[PDB]
């Protein structure tokens, strides 16, 4: 072959696989706030770098810009967040992002099933799944200091993959692929995506980028 790689499948929790299958099929209105709950993880990312960094400055020796840029992609129908955030380890990125039970699940999940703003239930990790409301499968690439490049996917259905990234070297970070369902295009528009977030991530203390071709 071109490439080959060892790839290690996982089972989702319990309470997470019902979470995804939730936010799958639910008719929730508003979709948008996805990109309000991914921006505030980077934020959160992109925070605890920078406190690591107030006590030991070479934690930015693999970048010291702290920021978000947002990349839509028309031809391969993908919209990328990416922050210069902590990154994830391996061990990281197994235990939040599929294998253990998160705080803000069940009220995620009432909040859904109710039709309220998920976005005023607080500021959760979990709010990730909310990708799934616009796209059909998600991609988490990801790099911590003193550690390899990663790549969880997952198109739910129960199971998610981790593998050592073979992609574009990142310095520090993580990396949201989001492979749009093919209703949801509306989220590669240039005005759509400036709209969403000055209505719902306007106060966010790193710069945010878009970058439009
Ligand atoms: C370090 C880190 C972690 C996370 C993250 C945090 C929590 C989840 N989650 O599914 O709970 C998913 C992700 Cl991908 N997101 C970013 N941007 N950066």
């Given at each position: 072959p071109?490439?080959?790689?060892?790839?290690?499948?996982?089972?989702?929790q319990?309470e997470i696989?019902?979470?995804?299958?939730?936010?799958?099929?639910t008719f929730?209105?508003?979709?948008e706030?996805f990109l309000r709950?991914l921006?505030s993880?980077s934020?959160?990312a992109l925070?605890?770098?920078?406190?690591?960094?107030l006590t030991?400055?070479?934690?930015?020796?693999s970048?010291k810009e702290?920021?978000?840029?947002?990349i839509?992609?028309?031809?391969?129908?993908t919209?990328?967040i990416?922050?210069?955030g902590?990154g994830?380890?391996?061990?990281?990125?197994?235990?939040?992002?599929?294998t253990?039970?998160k705080?803000?699940?069940?009220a995620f999940?009432?909040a859904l099933?109710?039709?309220?703003?998920?976005?005023?239930?607080?500021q959760?990790?979990?709010?990730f799944?909310s990708?799934?409301?616009?796209?059909?499968?998600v991609?988490v690439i990801?790099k911590?200091n003193?550690?390899?490049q990663?790549?969880?996917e997952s198109?739910?259905?129960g199971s998610?993959?981790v593998?050592?990234d073979?992609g574009?070297?990142?310095?520090?970070?993580?990396?949201?692929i989001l492979?749009?369902?093919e209703?949801?295009?509306?989220?590669?528009?240039?005005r759509?995506?400036?709209?969403?977030?000055?209505?719902h991530?306007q106060?966010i203390g790193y710069?945010?980028?878009l970058?439009?071709?």
């Amino acid at each position: 072959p071109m490439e080959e790689e060892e790839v290690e499948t996982f089972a989702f929790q319990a309470e997470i696989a019902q979470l995804m299958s939730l936010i799958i099929n639910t008719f929730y209105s508003n979709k948008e706030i996805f990109l309000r709950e991914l921006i505030s993880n980077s934020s959160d990312a992109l925070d605890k770098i920078r406190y690591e960094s107030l006590t030991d400055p070479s934690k930015l020796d693999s970048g010291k810009e702290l920021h978000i840029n947002l990349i839509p992609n028309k031809q391969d129908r993908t919209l990328t967040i990416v922050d210069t955030g902590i990154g994830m380890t391996k061990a990281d990125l197994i235990n939040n992002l599929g294998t253990i039970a998160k705080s803000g699940t069940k009220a995620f999940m009432e909040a859904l099933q109710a039709g309220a703003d998920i976005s005023m239930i607080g500021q959760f990790g979990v709010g990730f799944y909310s990708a799934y409301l616009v796209a059909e499968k998600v991609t988490v690439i990801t790099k911590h200091n003193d550690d390899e490049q990663y790549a969880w996917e997952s198109s739910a259905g129960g199971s998610f993959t981790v593998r050592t990234d073979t992609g574009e070297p990142m310095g520090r970070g993580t990396k949201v692929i989001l492979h749009l369902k093919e209703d949801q295009t509306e989220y590669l528009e240039e005005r759509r995506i400036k709209e969403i977030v000055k209505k719902h991530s306007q106060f966010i203390g790193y710069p945010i980028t878009l970058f439009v071709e």
